[PDB]
Amino acid sequence: QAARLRRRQLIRQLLERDKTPLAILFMAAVVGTLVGLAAVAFDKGVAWLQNQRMGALVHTADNYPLLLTVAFLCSAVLAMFGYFLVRKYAPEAGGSGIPEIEGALEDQRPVRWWRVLPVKFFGGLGTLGGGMVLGREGPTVQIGGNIGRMVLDIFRLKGDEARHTLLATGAAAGLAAAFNAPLAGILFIIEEMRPQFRYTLISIKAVFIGVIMSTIMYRIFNHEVALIDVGKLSDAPLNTLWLYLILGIIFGIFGPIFNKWVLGMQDLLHRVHGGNITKWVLMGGAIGGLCGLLGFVAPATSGGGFNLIPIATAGNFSMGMLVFIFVARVITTLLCFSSGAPGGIFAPMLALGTVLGTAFGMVAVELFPQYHLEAGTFAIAGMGALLAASIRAPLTGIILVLEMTDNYQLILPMIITGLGATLLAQFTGGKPLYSAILARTLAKQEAEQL
Amino acid sequence: QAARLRRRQLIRQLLERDKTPLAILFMAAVVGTLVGLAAVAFDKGVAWLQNQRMGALVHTADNYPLLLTVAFLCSAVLAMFGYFLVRKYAPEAGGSGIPEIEGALEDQRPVRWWRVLPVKFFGGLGTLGGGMVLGREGPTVQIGGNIGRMVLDIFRLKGDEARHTLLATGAAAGLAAAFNAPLAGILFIIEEMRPQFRYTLISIKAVFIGVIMSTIMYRIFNHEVALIDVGKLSDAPLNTLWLYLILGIIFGIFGPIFNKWVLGMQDLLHRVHGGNITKWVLMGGAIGGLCGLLGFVAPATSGGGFNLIPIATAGNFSMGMLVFIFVARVITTLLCFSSGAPGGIFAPMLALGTVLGTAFGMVAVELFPQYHLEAGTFAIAGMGALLAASIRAPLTGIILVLEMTDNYQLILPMIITGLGATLLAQFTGGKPLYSAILARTLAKQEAEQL
């Protein structure tokens, strides 16, 4: 009966497949409407502190000394307000938010919306609005997971089913509304987010419904908008593909290395505030300010990244400038994330990738003039190549780019790259940056209950 | 230690995540090169029997009586040769091939490439080349799974890991090269194909490598080609979205109903050959011929579907003609699939969807002239809407369309439809057509070992 019994199960299971209680759906449908209706508010707000912080630089646009200082001041002030809410009211909403919600799907590091919501919301609203090199996924994904179980508790639903689900959708609807990438939002909650070592109980269809409602919300407000807009680029002939493997490899070897820095520098930053709820808040206002300053002198180095970059570059920067920008951001990016302020490195890793990808093309363009190349295609190929080597979630990367870049012509080179970026990132022993961070924020949670 | 032990595991697991033995990869890399190099050969061949079967209709293009008969004759002959190889040498390669490979991932209905390969290959090469309303995924996906374990056995690899994997990739690389849809190929092997009631042991990254190599093969041969080509259509403003829900609902209620027919008519077809390895082969040559005839008089009703349809329609058919075509194909489609000849209903369900979707638009166009609508967008919305309600695998449907239609502008309406197509397809109690077929081909395998 070992073999002949499985059948009696499957057949009862197959013909019973796709089980989703109408309440989990109608509910995920709500998590989406809110998680999304949240990001639109968050976003439009972070975009307002940038409008104001930029409005004060034309009021005093007479003398550079004052200007170059109010700049540093506004960002430093906001970064403060930020690191504060995090350090005092909920040290959980510091950093990204994915590695955390990602744990909550394994049932650990529970979710306390009652705090994290208004914290992460205003905290990040501070850091991002400051003009720091932080992406806005972290906040939305977390605020999302939270807006998730918040409604799980307000309507008190039972089972692991409705718990794991209503959370995941809040997260997908999160990432989705952060980039207006519904497809990328979903594929994320099932290649990354979700618990990876044992069957899950998340209902895809519930996630879907979430993602849509969230995406609809984004469309409702941000009418006729595209975060990144590059036209259509050249095509990528077969006799060119290999070049994208080479690039994938480079992203591969670099991917892990970057992790060591991002990961190992949130240490060489803990040895400057030691946990001091203020020395920390001051250190933050410091780098936060540094950004506001860079925001005026050489903006290529500050900013949430794509705020102009993937575009201004997928077309025309001097080889050197690229290199500068790359390194410049490599720092500022770590500096802001590693410190521990609200906001993720998802976005800024898109920028870095785009810049590094461009640079590669730059070179390939002049070495094989027999190919008639446009550096751009290499910028798009390597846009999510860093995600692929660092947080190691290619599919979500590939679809996410295609989602907001719209050049399916390059779908092949895009994979060829991102795929080799996960290989050379394994044979060099790297780790899913988002997990390696859970491990840390978990093993250092274990040796603290003794 | 209940709670505090899980941690000691995860942390050992997290930091150990992404385990893939270099041999499984290098191997999947081979399954892809072959599974793909197989479809290109299969395809180009099925396209040749259509060139020849069409070459004989210009040799005798004088008199309609002879013409209208050699037409029926060639198809009837080929369909014969087809149902034969299936009935005599391997009754496993009859029907699609997905419900079967889909079982092999649960470990049942084992795979015997030594037979099924040359059978499904030439068998379908017969049926499809005949011009029957059968898609070419079935054959490739199966021939793929088979080319899969074939190399698992030729190189004899161990574990459930390398078995489940090398199979799945052969399948993904299958679907992938069948539509030149790498992304759809992958998302399929993880929303459908794969065992759904317990953690799997398939290595995504292995699948990836397969899909690519397969897709590269397709590009290697079919240079500058697109199976379906519709330009860019109008955009889909917010004040229009709901219309696509309505459509999703309709696809929802219809989805299951169709299943009952496809499913319940492979019965009202068994009562005409009773298992007779010849009455069957004759019944086949019959409907197979019927197609060759329709292939000349009203082609909208025969053919693998998109062979002109999703295009000639995503633009201009009379409301009625659509209706005709819809019903006409509804039959011919079942008739060919249900009979039990090699070839799937994946493709033909795209056609039906496109026709039904068009029809919906047709109507919506003239009812809300306040919207400035193009029926087309509704054709694309509902292209994979049948897949969504019938085989109930939306994500694979949505990406598959976008993959070969290239209108991301409609990504929202595409989901809004396909999503509502799985809801109204649950609240009406339908089942994953691909599973319901495994159940059947499994429970009738159990009551045959007594």
Whose structure tokens read 């459509």? B247
Way it was determined: X-ray
CA distances for B42 relative to A273, B135, B148, angstroms:
67, 13, 16
User: Chain B: residue nearest A25 by CA?
Assistant: B423
- For helices B113-130 and B137-154, angle between their N-to-C axes, nearest 10 degrees: 160
Residue B223 C-alpha, separation from nearest chain A C-alpha, in angstroms: 9
Maximum Cα interatomic distance, chain B, rounded to a whole number of Å: 87
A 10 A CB-CB count for A73 gives: 17
The Cα angle at residue B163 between residues A106 and B88, in degrees rounded to 5 = 135
Cα separation of A99 and B389, whole Å?
35
* Residue A185: closest CA among A407, A393, A21: A393
The resolution in angstroms reads 3.5
> Which chain B residues touch A426 with a CB distance below 8 Å?
18, 20
Cα separation of A235 and B98, whole Å?
34
Q: Pull the structure tokens for residue A407.
A: 């050049």
Give backbone dihedrals phi and psi of B122, rounded to 5 degrees, phi first.
Answer: -75, -35
Task: Indicate the SS3 state at residue A107.
Answer: coil
Can you give B60-75 as a three-state secondary structure string?
A: CCCCHHHHHHHHHHHH
Whose structure tokens read 């040796």? A447
DSSP A135: B
What stretches of A156-256 adopt beta strand conformation (E)? none
Whose structure tokens read 């996924």? A137
Cα separation of B433 and B418, whole Å?
16
Breaks (C-N over 2.5 A) in chain A follow: none
Q: How many CA atoms lie within 13 A of B120 on its CB side?
A: 34
- For helices A113-130 and A64-89, angle between their N-to-C axes, nearest 10 degrees: 170
Decide if A449 and B215 are in contact by the 8 Å CB cutoff: no
Q: Mutate which of A14, A102, A419 to test chain B, going by most B C-beta atoms within 10 A?
A: A14
Q: Give the CA-trace dihedral at A104, A119, A133, A348, to 10 degrees.
A: 30
Q: Are B35 and B173 in contact (CB under 8 A)?
A: yes
Q: Pull the structure tokens for residue B160.
A: 């459930």
Q: How many CA atoms lie within 13 A of B74 on its CB side?
A: 25
CA distances for B97 relative to A24, A294, B156, angstroms:
34, 60, 24
Q: Which residue type, as a one-letter code, is found at position B150?
A: M
**Distance between alpha carbon B48 and the CA centroid of its chain, in Å?**
21
**Beta-carbon contacts of residue A126 (< 8 Å; ≥ 6 apart):** A49, A78, A79, A80, A81, A82, A85, A342
Q: Is any Cβ of chain A less than 8 angstroms from the Cβ of B14?
A: yes
Please provide the distance, in angstroms rounded to a whole number, between the alpha carbons at the two ends of chain B.
48
Q: Are A336 and A351 in contact (CB under 8 A)?
A: no
CA distances for A170 relative to A207, A398, A401, A425, angstroms:
8, 22, 21, 30
Q: Are B60 and B67 in contact (CB under 8 A)?
A: yes
Task: Indicate the SS3 state at residue A202.
Answer: coil
CA distances for B86 relative to A405, B123, B175, B342, B449, angstroms:
46, 7, 21, 8, 22
Q: Which residue type, as a one-letter code, is found at position A289?
A: G
Domains along the sequence of chain B with CATH: 1-450 (1.10.3080.10)
Cα separation of B324 and B326, whole Å?
5
**Beta-carbon contacts of residue B364 (< 8 Å; ≥ 6 apart):** B243, B371, B373, B375, B378
Q: Which residue type, as a one-letter code, is found at position B50?
A: Q
Decide if B25 and A238 are in contact by the 8 Å CB cutoff: no
Whose structure tokens read 């990876």? A196
H/E run at residue B145:
helix B137-154
> Which chain B residues touch A8 with a CB distance below 8 Å?
446
Q: Mutate which of B183, B194, B212, B428 to test chain A, going by most A C-beta atoms within 10 A?
A: B183
